[PDB]
Design a protein around this nucleic acid. Sequence first.
DNA 1: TACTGTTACGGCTCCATCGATGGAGCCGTAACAGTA
DNA 2: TACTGTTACGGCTCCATCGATGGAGCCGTAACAGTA
Lengths: 634, 634
Amino acid sequence: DYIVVKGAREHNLKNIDVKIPRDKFVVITGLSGSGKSSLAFDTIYAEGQRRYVESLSSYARQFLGQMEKPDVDYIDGLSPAIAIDQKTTSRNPRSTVGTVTEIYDYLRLLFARIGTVTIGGKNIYEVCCLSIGEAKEFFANLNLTERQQLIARQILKEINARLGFLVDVGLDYLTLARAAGTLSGGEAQRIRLATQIGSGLMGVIYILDEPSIGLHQRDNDRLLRSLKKLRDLGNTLLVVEHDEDTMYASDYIIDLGPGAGSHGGQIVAEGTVEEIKQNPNSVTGEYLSGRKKIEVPKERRKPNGKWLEIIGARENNLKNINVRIPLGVFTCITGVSGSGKSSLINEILYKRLAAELNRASVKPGEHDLIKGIEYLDKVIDIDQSPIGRTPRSNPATYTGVFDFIREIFANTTEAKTRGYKAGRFSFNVKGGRCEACAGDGINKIEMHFLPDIYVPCEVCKGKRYNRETLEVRYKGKNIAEVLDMTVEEALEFFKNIPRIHKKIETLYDVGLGYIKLGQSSTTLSGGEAQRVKLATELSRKSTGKTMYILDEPTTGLHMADVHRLVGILHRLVEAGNSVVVIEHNLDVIKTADYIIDLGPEGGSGGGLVVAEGTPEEVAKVENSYTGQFLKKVL
Amino acid sequence: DYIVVKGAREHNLKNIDVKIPRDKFVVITGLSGSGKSSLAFDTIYAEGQRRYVESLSSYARQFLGQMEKPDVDYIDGLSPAIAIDQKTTSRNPRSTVGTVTEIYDYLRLLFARIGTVTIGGKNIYEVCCLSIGEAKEFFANLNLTERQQLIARQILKEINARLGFLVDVGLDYLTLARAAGTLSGGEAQRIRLATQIGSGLMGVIYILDEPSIGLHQRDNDRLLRSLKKLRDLGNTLLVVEHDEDTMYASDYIIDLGPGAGSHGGQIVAEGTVEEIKQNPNSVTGEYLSGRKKIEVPKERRKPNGKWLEIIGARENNLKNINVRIPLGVFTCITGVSGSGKSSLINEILYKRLAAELNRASVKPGEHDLIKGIEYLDKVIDIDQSPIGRTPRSNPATYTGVFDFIREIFANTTEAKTRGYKAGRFSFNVKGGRCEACAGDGINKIEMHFLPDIYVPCEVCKGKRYNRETLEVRYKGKNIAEVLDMTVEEALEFFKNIPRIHKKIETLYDVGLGYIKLGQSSTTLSGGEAQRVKLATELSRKSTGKTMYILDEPTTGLHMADVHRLVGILHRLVEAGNSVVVIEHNLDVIKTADYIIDLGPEGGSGGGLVVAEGTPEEVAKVENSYTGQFLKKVL
DNA sequence: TACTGTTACGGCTCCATCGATGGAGCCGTAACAGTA
DNA sequence: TACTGTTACGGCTCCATCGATGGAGCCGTAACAGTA
Ligand SMILES: Nc1ncnc2c1ncn2[C@@H]1O[C@H](COP(=O)(O)OP(=O)(O)NP(=O)(O)O)[C@@H](O)[C@H]1O
Ligand SMILES: Nc1ncnc2c1ncn2[C@@H]1O[C@H](COP(=O)(O)OP(=O)(O)NP(=O)(O)O)[C@@H](O)[C@H]1O
Ligand SMILES: Nc1ncnc2c1ncn2[C@@H]1O[C@H](COP(=O)(O)OP(=O)(O)NP(=O)(O)O)[C@@H](O)[C@H]1O
Ligand SMILES: Nc1ncnc2c1ncn2[C@@H]1O[C@H](COP(=O)(O)OP(=O)(O)NP(=O)(O)O)[C@@H](O)[C@H]1O
Ligand SMILES: [Zn+2]
Ligand SMILES: [Zn+2]
């Protein structure tokens, strides 16, 4: 009936007790860095996997891999659990849709056990090179004999369920032979969801960590309907989401908070959506109830006569459209997943602007020409791919600050007298780091089947530096203490140095005032990593006439975080710059002064400019789903 | 709280609903063939394993191996389960004790992670070639540094728990370098128990199928104390046992019945031991309450002046003892497990009697000479090893009956006119079997990861024979119907043929009147297989002066079955023969007219004749545990 | 003279046991070029 | 002349992905020898 958890202190959870109902729709909400992922995936899923693995033999444990033991005391009512990780997975080019979704293995088994080899007048190759919808239709009309049906009932059932889920989510325009490495974000997310939650089971806990990455509102609604259908089978659903639709379509909501990092990790509000709204201490309830919201501008800026014309854009699935992008205003490029907006913007506009301004060597997409490039001076872009996590990377090194800090540290009098350079003051370069731990600071000993044990180094005491490097101090603080201070302390510490102060203020402006400069990248959260990347790309100097291109910056960001980002972008636009954002979040779109809509479908059915104009104008077009969704908001 | 199971119809269960309490000691009792193993290991363990496996990936499922789906509807309250199979496992000579118990892997990990390689002034080899007790003492006195203790805490804990369990069960005389293929039955059983139930867990269901194979009463009591200690950790224990001690030391007993085979598969009585005793419908309660029991003879037969003297027996661990075996009476060779009774009897007495009577070519053990061999004519022996299970074997072929049946079938007029032989009338010989199914009758299609599906053959319709072979009938019945009749029908069908009637009556005398002549060996139960082997060895002709040697014939036999066997043996002895039985069951021992006791311990501490004489005389020796246990019974 | 032990010999079935490689991202370093 | 774009290049880290063999037992068949 319940999955009651008591005494949870993993990561930053402050010894909280949470009771999760079974066989229901439960949503974990909170700010970026609250501790939702550490609460679900790092505690409940870890405990379930460890308990199910300890009962197996040593050989099976070695061949599977046990995860770390959660720092939780009481966990009861658990069950076999299937979890989908928040982090995106990169697929090698050899992988295909059928191989990833495992439909290819079922097809091979069916053809080996039933092939006389053709099944229903079709060999393996012609059904492998087939669209999902027509493959489902062909498999639902099979007329094999009774003996074959008895032999291969389970294979047929699994294939039918998987193809039904893939059709339900809205992915019937793809082919089983399509490479997985050439798909959009939303399509790849749907494929990943279909891989695990495709063939549903009974009495199994399902854990989903933000399953709506790069999905439109229509795709999100379809996925929600599929999830409700799956839950009706008698399963438990635990979803960590920042979306309003998922919060509204749920039976129970557990809200963490009240902040992020060291200031969060507790439970603030619990109950249904209304109880969340009526609780003052809940930030999510405050945003849902409308007490705090992203302000829609009554007056929208008009273009100043300067336009960016894209003529003959036919890259990927684009059907030779002409799109005009106004300059000097905030423009949002919206559309259903797979409609062809990223393949337009990031593959033509940015790849041409960089080539013509930053002297890059990137070949753009298939297009005729772009008019109006002379009106800009530089282009700054944020890709849709996530950041790479390494233990040798921290936000200080990520946002180009470590170079300046090492330079100033090497510029001190003691460093000059000792004949040192900036290389010594880094833990990734031989000479200044503690060679016993190779600059790691902590040591991770890995066993064969038992969980790993982390033992800190005793030579450096976790400071990653030897005595010689730590003997030189700048303004009374060494480099270890410089790396150990939060972003607010660095801002208060580098006031008189504009070069470092600019980047530190950029980091602080996105809401990372609690993040230590030396916190490991692997330990960073998804939202914190996204904000770190945003600060990295937004800390660069702007000339007043520049293009800002953002590809889904809402990934892993709460309502407060996207409100902060919207304010930053609006100030940047008011400074004189022009911003183009590929967005799926309605809050960001409703504040845009111009919208370019693509559709009306995804895949081969899209690539046409359905709507173009201000949000009020777009809301009057019933053909586009974006207009239908914007009509309710306005 | 409960593991409630409803709608169970696997094998021969007749749609019964059973509620099993959690965190308790539960014993499943019943006759041989009732359905206890099919109720626990084939249903509850199968469901638990399948549910825990379905949540893993396809690769993990392929690398692990999913078992068959039980034919059960409702199962709730399950948990990760560890089960020990009833069937004994044969180990290759390369295996050792440490390798089997996995202590060798933990030792290697500890020496690789802590070795400077010597730990505590000892290398790997000197601790590998060490006794269990002294190894435990050495590991409990380790004085490694704090950092090493923090690094290797889990390895030390696991090693200490495993060695503690091995010492508790009573294996302190063994060495980690001892080959697993040269151990006794009880020692191998205890090693198998230590492999899985050694390092206990929390909240895990433990399923044990007859864990007291070849164990004395003292060893059984020690194992029971260990099991109670394990259950006190907060686990559930489900043991399928025929022992009285296990039934008495339990919290709940679920009794199946009321018979065996098609006549059983239901639930007769439930509750504690007293409630079982007070239920008339329960056979186990009737035997426990003393209403039905194995009768102890008031007068015991005395030796007739003919004795079998073994002089200088020093095989294995025997310390050069001289043992006198009376002839013409029932003799039981008893002692603690590992004391050296099998290595005496089956390695000297039988191996010399066969060589001197049946003209065998087996080299006996290390002994000086045996006097009195001229007093016997032949020797019949039953080994302690279990039978081999193959789908090409059935009880009719096992107990030498199929040869006679094929001979008489080939002797018919139609077979003579058609020019056939006895080879055609067998499903393991080309020519008479259905070549489509190769005589298997049923077809088992095996997948990669999905459970196998059994589809019967359509050419032969499961009769394993073609039309030509089935066209010839003897006494109105073909060979398929001859194989399809039970043992009672065969007894009523072969009344006028003494050769077949003798073997059929021998099969029926052990309680196998419901077993079809063509039932597969792999589908046979452990007790049914043991009784089949007993009938095979007891169906041979006796000359009136012959030696019968039995090595633990109680394996898998209920109280009623051992009562039937005791009656058979007593009638055989009264016929003029002499029977020597190596026994651990007190019911068989209390009826013996002479007992030879070995001990007083196992391994290197045993091999001495502690007691020798009638049970009343043996009960007066306090040095022997057998006497102490016999004192209470008498 | 036939029944009952042994042996060999061919064919069938069951059961125990023993992570590396390629692709991608990031950090530090160097060099080259455009612009205020 | 210094600040800010680009490129390359070496070293480090993370993540996705693709059952066979030997030993033992059993069945059918043949041959050989001892005994009632
Ligand atoms: N290399 C490629 N070759 C062929 N088709 C491709 C390729 N890359 C992407 N596509 C297809 O082009 C269509 C548009 O994808 P793309 O424009 O990259 O993403 P998008 O529409 O912005 N979706 P999303 O990022 O989720 O909002 C989809 O149907 C993709 O499957
Ligand atoms: N090893 C660690 N020790 C202490 N704090 C940590 C550690 N790893 C992560 N954190 C912090 O713990 C907080 C919660 O982490 P996590 O649970 O991953 O975030 P989250 O709330 O799910 N955010 P998001 O995924 O963006 O919605 C973040 O502020 C992390 O920086
Ligand atoms: N090949 C062998 N070499 C050395 N020791 C052996 C060998 N086989 C058995 N032993 C040991 O001899 C002792 C007696 O074993 P054995 O007499 O065969 O069994 P047992 O006493 O009848 N036990 P059980 O069958 O369980 O009642 C035990 O300590 C065995 O480990
Ligand atoms: N496939 C089958 N179909 C029908 N009956 C079967 C099948 N397999 C086994 N049986 C019979 O089902 C009965 C119960 O089997 P099983 O559960 O293995 O016995 P058990 O009661 O545990 N006996 P034992 O292990 O000796 O104590 C026996 O009479 C078997 O012969
Ligand atoms: Zn160090
Ligand atoms: Zn057939």
